[PDB]
Ligand binder design. Structure first.
Ligand SMILES: Nc1nc2c(CCc3ccccc3)c3nc[nH]c3cc2c(=O)[nH]1
Ligand SMILES: Nc1nc2c(CCc3ccccc3)c3nc[nH]c3cc2c(=O)[nH]1
Ligand SMILES: [Zn+2]
Ligand SMILES: [Zn+2]
Lengths: 352, 352
C-alpha cells in the first residue's frame, strides 16, 4: 500500500522541481493543478466554506464523506474556511479563538475537514488583507502561527485523520521578507507535511507576487511540497514553478468557462466575440481535449451566444483540460532539463 | 448504400408499430424520440427558427451545413419555422404568401432547411391556435394545405435535396374530425415521405389530444411514419404510440433538466426539494445512464442548489437517457407482443 504521505523529487532545473506525492488514495504528479471538484487531475478541491453551510459537515459525514458524496476516490484537498469566511461572509467577528460569522476556530476547521474526509487538510490561517502595514501584517501572521500550532494539535488528536490524511501549514507575512521568514521558521518548528504560501493572489499584481515568491519559497523546507494558494493565470503558474512551487489551485478555469473565456497556447480568447462566429478551428489548434477533437470555435460561440448550457460545459471541459496539459508540459520539460526554454517559448507565444 | 428514405414496419400490436426508417445518413428505430441537438438518439433536431436568425441559414451553409457545424453525422430533422415565428416572435404579419415578422414563406422555409442540410424537412404549415372555431380551423387548414403543395414543389426543385432528404406533410384541422380528414386527403394526394399530426400540444390537455389522435392517425397512410409534433410527457408518448405514432419531439427533457425536474419510472421528481438532500439512491434505481451509475440524488440536489452547471448537465443527461430507455422499452415490447401489458405496467408505476 502507498504511504500516508511521501513527497519525492525526480528532477530539478534551477528552483523548479518535478516529482510525486504518494498518498493512500493515489499518486499526485507535481507540479500539480488542482481543479474544483464541482467541475486528468490527480487531486480535486472540496469547498469547505460552502459544504459546512450546505448540507453541513455532519451531513456530509453521514452521507459517507466527500469521496463517496462526489463519486471521486482519489485525493481531495480542502481549505480551512477562514479565507472564504473573510471574503464571502457578512458580519464577521474575529478574535484569538477564531472567527464568528453569519464560530470557525482552528479546532473546528480541522474537525470539519475531518468529517468531510479530505486527504490534504489546510491549517486554519488568516489571509492577511492587502495591502497591510508591517504592524498589522505581523499581528496577523503571529495569530496565524498560533492557529497553525492549534491546527497541528487538533489534527494529531484525531487518529483516523492523523494516520490517513496530511496537514499543510500556511505561511503568511504579506509582502515583508522578515515576517515571511518568521512565519516559515514557526511553521517548520511545528512541522507539517507540506507548506503553502498564503496571502498572495489578493490583488498584488504578478510583479509583486513574483517578488514575494523570490525570497519566500526558499524559506520553506526544500524536501516538502510547496503550494501557492489561489494562483493563477497560466503565466502565473509558469513563473511560480520557476520559483519553486509544486501545487496550484485557481478559480480561473471554471470562472472563465462560465463567462466565455477560453485559455489557449496563444492566450485567452472570449468566444462570444463576433470574430469567432465563422471560425472553424477548434478552441486551440494543439489541444488534445475532447471538445477540440469534435467542435469548432464557431459552434461553441453559437451555443454560448444562444444561452445553451452545453456551451459553458464545453468551455469548462476545455479550460480544465488545457490547464492539465500545461502542467504535463511543465513536468515533462523539467524532467527533461528544458523547462527554462519552455518558459521562454510559452511566454513568447502566449503573449504574442 | 442505404436508400434516401425507406420505412419498414417489423411488428405491430393493435395500432402500435415498431420498425425502422432507413436514410443515407443512418437508421432510425421507431417509435423514436428526437432530442434537441443542442443537448442513444438516432436523429436529432435542428432549431430552424433560431438558426435562420443566428448565424443565419446562409452562414450555416458556408460553415458546411448543420452536420459539420454541430459535429453530428447522422440524420437531422428540422421544423419549418412558422410555429416558432408564431409563438416566439413579435409584430407578426400573415398572408397567403407567408408570414412576416421582426418574410418566411413555404419556398423560403424549404430553402432555409436545404441550406441547413437537414435530412428530414418539414412542410411549412400554420399551427392553428387553440381553441379555434370550425371556420377559423378550416381556413387555417386550407392555407396549410396550399402551403404543403408549395413546400412539395420547392423541395422537388432542389436536386440535392430531392435526392438526399425526405419531406413530411403536416396535418392540421384543430380538433375537428372532418377537417382532419380533409387535411389528410390533401396531404396524401400531394404525397410525402412521412406525415405529421400538427396542431396538438398547444394546450388542449391529454384527454382531448388522445381523442383527436383516435380518429386522426388512421387517416394517414398506414405505410408511412407518423410524427406527433411537440409531444410530450412520457405518459403522452406511451398513449400516442398506442394510437399509431412513430416519432416524437418534446421540449420537456431539456426544459425539465434545466429547472430541477428528473423523469423516473416512478414519475417526475424535483431534485431541489429538501427530501433529496440525503437520498443516496441514483436519480432512478433502474436507469442505465452514466449519471445514475456514479452519482446520488443527494449530490445532484447539492450541485443544483449550489448553482453549479454540472448539476443541470447531469439532470439533462439523465432525462435524455431516460427518454431513450423509454423508447427502447416501447420498441422491445411492441416487437415482443406485450406492449399492451407494458403500457398498463408503465402507467400503474409512473402514476403511483
Ligand atoms: N487558507 C487560505 N486560502 C487562501 C486562498 C483559497 C485557496 C483554496 C484552496 C482550496 C479550495 C478553495 C480555496 C486563496 N485564494 C486566493 N488567494 C488565497 C490565499 C489564501 C490564504 O492565504 N489562505
Ligand atoms: N411545424 C409545426 N411545428 C409544431 C411544433 C414544433 C415541433 C418541432 C420540431 C422540431 C424542432 C422544433 C420544433 C409543435 N410543438 C408543439 N406543438 C406543435 C405543433 C406544431 C405544428 O403544428 N407544426
Ligand atoms: Zn481543448
Ligand atoms: Zn439515469
Amino acid at each position: 500500500d502507498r504511504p500516508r504521505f511521501s513527497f519525492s523529487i525526480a528532477a530539478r532545473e534551477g528552483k523548479a522541481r518535478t516529482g510525486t506525492i504518494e498518498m493512500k488514495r493515489g499518486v499526485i504528479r507535481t507540479p500539480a493543478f488542482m481543479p474544483v471538484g464541482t467541475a486528468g487531475a490527480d487531486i480535486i478541491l472540496g469547498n469547505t466554506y460552502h459544504l459546512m453551510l450546505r448540507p453541513g459537515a455532519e451531513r456530509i459525514a453521514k452521507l459517507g464523506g466527500l469521496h463517496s458524496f462526489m463519486g471521486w476516490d482519489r485525493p481531495i484537498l480542502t481549505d480551512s474556511g477562514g479565507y472564504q469566511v473573510m471574503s464571502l461572509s457578512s458580519l464577521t467577528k474575529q478574535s484569538e479563538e477564531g472567527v464568528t460569522f453569519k464560530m470557525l476556530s482552528p479546532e473546528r476547521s480541522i474537525e470539519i475537514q475531518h468529517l468531510l474526509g479530505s486527504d490534504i487538510v489546510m491549517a486554519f490561517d488568516e489571509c492577511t488583507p492587502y495591502p497591510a502595514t508591517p504592524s498589522r501584517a505581523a499581528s496577523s501572521m503571529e495569530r496565524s502561527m498560533r492557529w497553525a500550532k492549534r491546527s497541528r494539535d487538533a489534527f494529531d488528536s484525531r487518529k483516523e485523520q492523523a494516520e490517513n490524511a496530511a496537514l499543510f501549514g500556511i505561511q503568511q507575512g504579506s509582502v515583508f521578507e522578515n515576517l515571511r521568514q518568521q512565519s516559515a521558521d514557526a511553521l517548520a518548528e511545528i512541522g507539517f507535511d507540506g507548506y503553502a504560501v498564503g496571502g498572495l493572489a489578493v490583488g498584488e499584481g504578478q510583479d509583486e507576487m513574483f517578488r514575494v515568491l523570490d525570497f519566500s519559497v526558499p524559506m520553506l523546507p526544500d524536501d516538502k511540497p510547496h503550494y501557492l494558494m489561489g494562483v493563477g493565470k497560466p503565466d502565473d503558474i509558469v513563473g511560480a514553478v520557476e520559483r519553486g512551487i509544486d501545487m496550484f489551485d485557481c478559480v480561473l478555469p471554471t470562472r472563465s468557462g462560465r463567462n466565455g473565456q477560453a485559455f489557449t497556447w496563444d492566450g485567452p480568447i472570449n468566444i462570444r466575440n463576433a470574430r469567432f462566429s465563422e471560425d472553424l478551428k477548434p478552441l486551440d489548434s494543439e489541444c488534445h481535449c475532447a471538445v477540440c477533437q469534435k467542435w469548432s470555435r464557431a459552434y461553441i460561440h453559437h451555443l454560448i451566444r444562444a444561452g445553451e448550457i452545453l456551451g459553458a460545459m464545453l468551455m469548462t471541459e476545455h479550460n480544465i483540460a488545457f490547464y492539465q496539459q500545461l502542467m504535463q508540459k511543465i513536468r515533462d520539460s523539467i524532467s527533461e532539463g528544458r523547462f527554462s526554454q519552455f518558459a521562454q517559448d510559452f511566454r513568447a507565444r502566449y503573449f504574442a
